[PDB]
């Protein structure tokens, strides 16, 4: 059933699962037209599909050409998301296919379920969690790649860089979501936090700096304080 604060450790068991967030599939800028009306222009997006256990993140770049001549685009995005997830699943060998797929927005249950009918033994689940994966486009190199894309294209990598070599997947996921949730509440600050020290570099194939364990703690604390802070500034508490 639904994924929530209780059945939370099920993410880290050995059942192959993926999360799917579609929030950045269909993105636009709103602008004025010469005649004073409003119009949307669309920009590249991205289906965020994440194996929370291994750290595998298969980005599916959505090129604005996919929309051309289409109506009800916010609705089609969800169908297109599920078309792309299905196609991913179908390309993996049997023993690598996920047993569950959890969507971050209940709107994706039907599109997906329909697209997956061929895979009756794959459970499609919602979640009750407020998860911050939409901030994924606040991670610099990902913003440049999705934007620089000229055609549909899929990136294969790991979203925890090399962390698992020293920490477990539960902790790895918790660090991910903290940084994401901070990037969402106050991107400028959250990013200022991550880069203040110019000697701690980001590797060629990494999103996060090459912190030490000691350094990760400072950072995590600071992102805590930030998320607690940025709440106050809002609710004046």
């Amino acid at each position: 059933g639904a994924m929530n604060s209780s059945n939370y450790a099920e993410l880290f068991n050995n059942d192959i699962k993926l999360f799917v967030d579609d929030t950045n599939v269909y993105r636009v800028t709103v602008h004025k037209t010469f005649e004073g009306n409003v119009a949307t222009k669309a920009i590249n997006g991205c289906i965020f599909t994440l194996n929370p256990k291994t750290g595998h993140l298969f980005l599916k770049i959505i090129h604005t050409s996919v929309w051309a001549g289409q109506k009800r685009l916010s609705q089609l995005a969800k169908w297109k998301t599920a078309e792309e997830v299905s196609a991913l699943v179908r390309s993996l060998p049997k023993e690598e296919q996920p047993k569950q797929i959890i969507v971050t927005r209940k709107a994706m249950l039907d599109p997906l379920e329909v697209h997956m009918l061929d895979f009756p033994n794959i459970a499609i689940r919602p979640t009750e969690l407020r998860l911050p994966f939409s901030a994924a486009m606040s991670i610099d190199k990902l913003s440049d790649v999705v934007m620089k894309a000229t055609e549909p294209q899929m990136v294969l990598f790991n979203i925890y860089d090399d962390w698992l070599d020293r920490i477990s997947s539960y902790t790895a996921f918790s660090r991910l979501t903290l940084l994401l949730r901070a990037l969402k509440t106050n991107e400028e600050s959250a990013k200022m936090i991550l880069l203040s020290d110019p000697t701690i570099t980001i590797k060629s194939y990494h999103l996060w700096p090459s912190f030490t364990d000691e350094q990760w703690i400072t950072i995590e604390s600071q992102m805590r304080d930030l998320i607690l802070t940025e709440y106050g500034r809002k609710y004046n508490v």
Binding site: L76, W79, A82, E83, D110, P111, E113, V114, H115, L117, D118
Partner: protein
């Protein structure tokens, strides 16, 4: 005019005949129902005075035999039976009419209610849904489940309605996933009408029997079928204009005939607010929309 005599009424029971019903008191002299219109299917059903649990009934057609009711005290219930000896049968009936121990099917002449509710209902189809082929009549009760319900336990005592499932491969063609699901014309027109039902009338009969089984026995799977078969049409952008016009009448009489106080279990909020106000056919059920809003505005 035809007749369903009773051997007797040993137990207090409420008897149903089509949309009518009357109280019979334990060992009152009652011997059945006369003047039953020839030309339509009918349903005699029963609710014992003790165990309001389990409404049960038999569908039948006087064209297909002489039928009588006989209470069976091992099994506890009024049983329908066919009399093969036609002469024996006329004799008994005449005996009971002369003594006047039969109530009369009480139809008003202006009233097309029963016809409208059974326009496309045909015994042969019912007997394919309630498989019990040694009997020319077909037994149904509250607790019977549907084939689709036994897939989500005894298969002989099931209601074998046509399986409709919007999130199935039958419903959904490869590569048209979003198209087929948001607009079920394919499913409706080719899979179901051309494929399984053949014509609109068979579809509508299943739909009318589903509804009557729901209303007379509160059979829950029947109700789900009814709303299912409604929903498919309303969710299809391409329907024959004649089928839309007949549906609107079909639903009108159903809604007209429903007990005001049974409405809250038998009308599915989602399906109706979708059909009437969201689906492709929101504008196409004028009679159905008018009576729903004047009678059950609370549901909307």
């Amino acid at each position: 005019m035809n007749t369903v005599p009773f051997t007797s009424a040993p137990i207090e029971v409420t008897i149903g005949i089509d949309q009518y019903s009357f109280n019979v008191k334990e060992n009152q002299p009652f011997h059945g129902i006369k003047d039953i219109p020839i030309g339509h299917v009918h349903v005699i059903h029963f609710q014992h005075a003790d165990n309001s649990s389990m409404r049960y009934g038999y569908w039948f057609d006087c064209r297909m035999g002489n039928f009588y009711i006989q209470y069976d005290p091992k099994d506890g219930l009024y049983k329908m039976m066919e009399e093969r000896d036609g002469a024996k049968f006329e004799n008994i009936v005449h005996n009971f009419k002369e003594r006047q121990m039969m109530v009369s099917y009480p139809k008003i002449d202006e009233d097309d209610t029963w016809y409208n509710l059974t326009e496309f209902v045909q015994m042969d189809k019912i007997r394919k849904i309630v498989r019990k082929d040694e009997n020319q009549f077909s037994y149904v009760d509250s607790s019977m489940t549907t084939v689709q319900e036994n897939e989500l336990s005894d298969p002989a005592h099931s209601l074998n309605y046509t399986v409709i499932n919007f999130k199935s491969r039958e419903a959904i063609r490869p590569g048209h996933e979003m198209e087929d699901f948001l607009d079920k014309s394919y499913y409706l027109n080719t899979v179901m009408l051309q494929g399984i039902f053949k014509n609109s009338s068979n579809y509508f009969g299943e739909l009318q029997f589903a509804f009557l089984n729901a209303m007379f026995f509160g059979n829950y799977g029947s109700s789900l079928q009814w709303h299912a078969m409604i929903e498919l049409i309303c969710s299809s952008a391409t329907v024959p204009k004649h089928m839309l016009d007949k549906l609107d009448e079909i639903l009108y009489y159903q809604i007209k005939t429903l007990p005001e106080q049974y409405s809250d279990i038998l009308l599915n909020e989602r399906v109706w607010n979708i059909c009437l106000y969201s689906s492709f056919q929101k504008n196409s059920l004028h009679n159905t929309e008018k009576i729903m809003e004047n009678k059950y505005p609370e549901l909307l």
